[PDB]
Amino acid sequence: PPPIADEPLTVNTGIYLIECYSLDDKAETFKVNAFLSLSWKDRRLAFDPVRSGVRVKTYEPEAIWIPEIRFVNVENARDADVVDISVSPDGTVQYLERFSARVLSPLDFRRYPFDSQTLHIYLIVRSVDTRNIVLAVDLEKVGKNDDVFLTGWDIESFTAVVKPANFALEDRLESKLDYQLRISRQYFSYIPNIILPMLFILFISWTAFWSTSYEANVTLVVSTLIAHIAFNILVETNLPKAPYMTYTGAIIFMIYLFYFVAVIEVTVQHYLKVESQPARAASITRASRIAFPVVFLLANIILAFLFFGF
Amino acid sequence: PPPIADEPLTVNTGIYLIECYSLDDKAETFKVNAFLSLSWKDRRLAFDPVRSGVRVKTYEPEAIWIPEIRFVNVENARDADVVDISVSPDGTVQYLERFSARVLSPLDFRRYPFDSQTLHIYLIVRSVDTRNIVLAVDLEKVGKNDDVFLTGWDIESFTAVVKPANFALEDRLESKLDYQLRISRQYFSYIPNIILPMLFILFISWTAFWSTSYEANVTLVVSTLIAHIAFNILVETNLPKAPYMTYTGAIIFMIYLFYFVAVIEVTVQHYLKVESQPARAASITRASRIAFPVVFLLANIILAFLFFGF
Amino acid sequence: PPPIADEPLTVNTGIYLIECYSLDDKAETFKVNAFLSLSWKDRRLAFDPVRSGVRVKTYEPEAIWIPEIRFVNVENARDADVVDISVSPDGTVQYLERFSARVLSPLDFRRYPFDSQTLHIYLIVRSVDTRNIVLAVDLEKVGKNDDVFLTGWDIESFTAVVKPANFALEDRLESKLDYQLRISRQYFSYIPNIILPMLFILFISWTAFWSTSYEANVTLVVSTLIAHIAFNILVETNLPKAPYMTYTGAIIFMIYLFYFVAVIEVTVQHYLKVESQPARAASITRASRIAFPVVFLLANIILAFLFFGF
Amino acid sequence: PPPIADEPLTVNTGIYLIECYSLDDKAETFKVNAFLSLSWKDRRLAFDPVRSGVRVKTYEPEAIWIPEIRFVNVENARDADVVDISVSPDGTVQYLERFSARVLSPLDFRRYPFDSQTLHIYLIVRSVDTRNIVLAVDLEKVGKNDDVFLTGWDIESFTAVVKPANFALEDRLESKLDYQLRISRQYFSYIPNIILPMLFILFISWTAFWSTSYEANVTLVVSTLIAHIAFNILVETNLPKAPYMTYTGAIIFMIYLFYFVAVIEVTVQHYLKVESQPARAASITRASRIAFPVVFLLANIILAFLFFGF
Amino acid sequence: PPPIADEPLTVNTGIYLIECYSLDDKAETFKVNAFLSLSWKDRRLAFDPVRSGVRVKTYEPEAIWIPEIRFVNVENARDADVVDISVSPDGTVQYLERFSARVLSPLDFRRYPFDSQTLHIYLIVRSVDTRNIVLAVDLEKVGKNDDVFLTGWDIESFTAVVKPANFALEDRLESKLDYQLRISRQYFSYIPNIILPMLFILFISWTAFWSTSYEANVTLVVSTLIAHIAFNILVETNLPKAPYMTYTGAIIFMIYLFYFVAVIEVTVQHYLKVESQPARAASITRASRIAFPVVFLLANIILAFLFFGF
Ligand SMILES: [Cl-]
Ligand SMILES: [Cl-]
Ligand SMILES: [Cl-]
Ligand SMILES: [Cl-]
Ligand SMILES: [Cl-]
Ligand code: NA
Ligand code: NA
Ligand code: NA
Ligand code: NA
Ligand code: NA
């Protein structure tokens, strides 16, 4: 039994995160636990303060018409819990439910682990005989609790995009609001834990340039290679899967390339040394001791700018 | 209390994906979150616009007969949410529920990671005293939302196969519709991440052909073999299990074969060298330097065509 | 209010798999999704075709007495969905529910991966004041849909054991039916993927018999041993846990034993060589080159016959 | 509306395992699927066989008072299914529900994998105006079905501790029964699969005592060490986490200790050999060949007795 | 229909843990299973002992007004089970529900594995027309059962912070109580299992200082490095992820640094030895034999005090 007038029905909305948690780099989901507040005018139940004697009349949710507001990108849907319904005398209604759901918002890993992310929660509502339109009420949207935390993330802002995106769908108007939680990573623990050790084992491979022992050099470059892969296995947990070209793992790919040309160089210095041209081998080796770090530092700089300064 | 006439009851159907997600290579399932729209004529509740005054009369789902449409291939069944029921005056009914479920559609991994897939969602309905037949209404079947994404997949099309497959079952006619979501993989991130490093460590093994040091050669070919398996462990996540003959992993099997014959060759060049026939050893080695890459490039071509050009 | 007569109540039963899936080697469970059909005579609701005018009278499940048929070996119990209830005029009732559950059927891994399995679904019903007995109706038991698949299994048959096992339990008769789904594995993908590479790395270890270099030989046999264990880690997923003596893994245990005696032999050839008896060392080595493969092929044959030909 | 008399209300109880499954060494839980039978006198509904004509009067659970029996150590609580309620003429009531839950019973891993375990299921009931006391009825407690199995365990007994533990709690008496399922492990598959290979790779390390090659010896002892850790990773699944001092893993710790002193000995024999005291090196080596196995066999015996014979 | 008077409504509260379990270092959650007791005055249902004849009048929860107490930091919300409602004659009500939930309390890993933790459970209640305030009743808050256990933790205390934190929220007063479970780890099993073996493999690397064999030394330091990473993979389960600077893993980072400078030193002693300055190499080596352990023991002491003595 929807409210009736010549105007489209506006429904004021407001999310308020009590807790957010379980960001899931793999499923691209994150759980949330929040208030939802709806508010809309219904003159059919507008009432008299004086004859009834009360400032506000509460109602059970079964009793009166309530718009079908729905989340769009939510798996584990319909976890709801009505907390309050308060009808104002002029017929404005104030609905307030607690809810929680696992939202599905895609993440972009290209600048990992310096990425920022912007999680989304959509709300549609579908029209009936009246057209229906949602819109954000900022006093009740200010959705961060001070206590919200994503471990390993700094939480920038929770705000709504004030203009609803109205559109046709299966022969009805539908109105969709977009709430956005913005976050950025706590990278620094990764410097001690991921980048530095990989670099150390790479440098250990570069030691081979001061050796002429082909036996010591294969044992060097190849044993550091095994160490490299084993270490990559060790941190496999902090290197989430993407079908796209990540920053980390561009530099990883580049590191495997350095293992390969280190092996090429070692093999060359040895073939050269056995073809009785020791001067060329010692020159290629003495050269590599400068060449390898430098092309690395350069390729690292190109690569950083390509992802960040671009 | 089903509607009655001399004709079989046609029920118009339409799926509309709001979100699809959680494709699961292991369980061969994927979650979906969509509209379902059913529509069918029931003259028993056909009514008068003039005497009742309204263009359309909505009903609670308990109130009137509703066909038992059911998904066939769905674990985590019965996640339903009625959104709209609108009865036209001629007795046509328009049902619209939001639902989500994890569909069970088998995947074919033979051309991984260049595979395309075609996910399926079936709908049966079972006959009563009236025969019953489902059929697809394209205006409400156009099921892709623009926002649907399978991370790492390009989503080609969501369409329904318009002819229902009617058939006897436990002494009743049953009618089954087939909706099909079509997808194809985002392979390219795999070239930097999977294929190139395996190739580099294999080439490092081929370095042994320029060495005559049996000590350096065992250390070479066998340490690169350990590196190879360790790397395979590293990418174990991106190589899903099949009971059948995959393209990748045909080439992987072939790589293990190349490690084996490299070891055979190394051992031969060394036994030959100790039997005082150094010319045969250096000829077998100098030969291997061309033979190995070439049979590889050839075997790779045969293998590519066998899977793709066949 | 159970039906009454001087006879024990027979209830005709019939399972019909629509889908089976998620065979779980670890939990020894598998999910299923099927029809259940019950059928039994109740003269109390037998009725007149002529005075009532209809061939069959349908009933809501709340309305009439329905036997408590129950699955025995089912975790995630009670996922039910009544589809049809049709009462015949003589009082026979035809019940038909769709259901799904995860069945608990033990698997036997001794001949893995050439094993066949025979999954079980039990049905008990418990007596009241009337004795009660289940029995299988083959027209509705023919439970395979053509579309059922267990990925990596060929599905032989779905049949029921026609004689119920009646027995006393907590002072009541109980009757239990046994339905059996029979399957056999798709082994062949395992030959390229598991057996051949293990064999290659073992043969690489046998290469040591053509070397006299103790340095090269320890590096050989022990680096192939590390490769072995790393490879075992790689295929750890396809080697399910058992508390019993599996075929695969008998041969695996035997492979570790071959690494051990290869190390013993290498060490012996070297101690012999340093005790200035080179003729014994070269004889033991030249002997091993035949002895190792042959005792392997023999032990493999004994072992195959012990598990298969026994 | 509880039954009233001058006596405390005794409630006879009885669990009957239909299936037990999913023992979880990690969460320290195990799933169960059983009957529960309650029985208690209620003269308020005692009735006349002659005037009513029936030997037993069944009731719907809503209709009559039923004690709040509750499991204590259960996550995934309240999975219930009433099967029977039968009231005797003198007012004794016989309740029977099927249920399943995941019970939380701590495991003790100190003698793994020769451990036995004793799983617990508690039942409290809380007092009202009448005091209330549970007590076990053995005819309906005999809870094993013949078909119960924990894969890899032998199931000794399912019995109840007949004396309830009554106690004050939040100003009411509460009565708690303790049912106990007793089990012991199937260790033997572990001898081929875990213990023997670790021992083989350790013995391979001991081979170094017959070599004087410091190059061969480091390659030996350290490559077997890497093999060891890799093997430990391989069986990581069968070595469950404890915050306490396990038997296995005492012996593992001891094995790492043997790797360490083998390295110490090897380094010593080599420093001695370069300080031109070859006699002391060859004596320390020739000594180690007996010392290492023996201190091992001894330490293994001490360690076995400390855990088992103590 | 809330109780009315000129005063704010105080609601006495009390949690009582029956079981706590499944502490989850990864999700930073832990499950709990407890009593909740609410108590508050409602004169509207105050009653006469004499005219009604009973000391206490029990009520069904539907029948009377009950405050909306709610947990704040709880995923898997609303697992409730009313156990008792007892109204005193003066109108005080005594509510008692059993519940269980997975609480979300952040953990601090900086002093792992010597950390203590302090888990939190919050309770808000929201005001209506009356202001509403929660407060803790210690006789029913004494929440530890003697049987509570977190495996691997010693459980210090379960207490409540007696002063509620009242505050404005969405135009209502809200009152929030804070219950705190305090725990501290069982570290000692980690000394045999994690710290000692890492130290052993590190010391094995330090053996290289008594060798001048560059072949033996690369094989030494680098093979121990691989061993190190493999071992880190073995204990990866007991080293939970943090975005911050942990104590363990500061020492791990420092260990990787020692591998790196051991490689540097080895390479230097070898380049020095080939530049025909053997005295500098043997001095740097003989120096390292004291320098490495000592800077380690010092760095370990600095690092211990920085985390613990600071
Ligand atoms: Cl050399
Ligand atoms: Cl050589
Ligand atoms: Cl040698
Ligand atoms: Cl030596
Ligand atoms: Cl050297
Ligand atoms: Na890992
Ligand atoms: Na993996
Ligand atoms: Na694995
Ligand atoms: Na593992
Ligand atoms: Na691991």
mmCIF file of C-alpha atoms in Angstrom, chain D residues 4 17 22 45 71-73 75 79 83 93 108 111 126 135 142 156 173 189 204 222 226 267 287 291 294-295:
data_model
loop_
_atom_site.group_PDB
_atom_site.id
_atom_site.type_symbol
_atom_site.label_atom_id
_atom_site.label_comp_id
_atom_site.label_asym_id
_atom_site.label_seq_id
_atom_site.Cartn_x
_atom_site.Cartn_y
_atom_site.Cartn_z
ATOM 1 C CA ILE D 4 4.962 -30.430 40.407
ATOM 2 C CA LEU D 17 25.596 -41.988 17.828
ATOM 3 C CA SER D 22 35.206 -34.863 10.864
ATOM 4 C CA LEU D 45 -0.876 -35.402 31.751
ATOM 5 C CA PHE D 71 24.732 -29.188 25.209
ATOM 6 C CA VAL D 72 27.574 -27.293 26.870
ATOM 7 C CA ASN D 73 30.620 -27.689 24.621
ATOM 8 C CA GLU D 75 29.625 -24.702 18.454
ATOM 9 C CA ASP D 79 20.545 -28.481 15.006
ATOM 10 C CA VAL D 83 11.254 -37.776 15.985
ATOM 11 C CA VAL D 93 7.074 -38.980 28.916
ATOM 12 C CA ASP D 108 46.147 -34.331 23.968
ATOM 13 C CA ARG D 111 52.109 -39.337 22.626
ATOM 14 C CA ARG D 126 18.984 -25.470 34.560
ATOM 15 C CA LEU D 135 20.561 -38.983 34.939
ATOM 16 C CA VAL D 142 24.313 -47.618 24.373
ATOM 17 C CA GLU D 156 36.831 -48.267 21.821
ATOM 18 C CA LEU D 173 21.044 -25.475 40.702
ATOM 19 C CA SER D 189 50.662 -46.358 8.116
ATOM 20 C CA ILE D 204 72.643 -40.602 4.504
ATOM 21 C CA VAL D 222 74.041 -29.882 4.275
ATOM 22 C CA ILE D 226 67.809 -29.406 3.066
ATOM 23 C CA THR D 267 84.293 -29.228 10.432
ATOM 24 C CA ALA D 287 84.790 -42.924 16.544
ATOM 25 C CA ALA D 291 79.063 -42.879 18.414
ATOM 26 C CA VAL D 294 74.501 -45.367 19.411
ATOM 27 C CA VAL D 295 73.766 -42.065 21.129
#
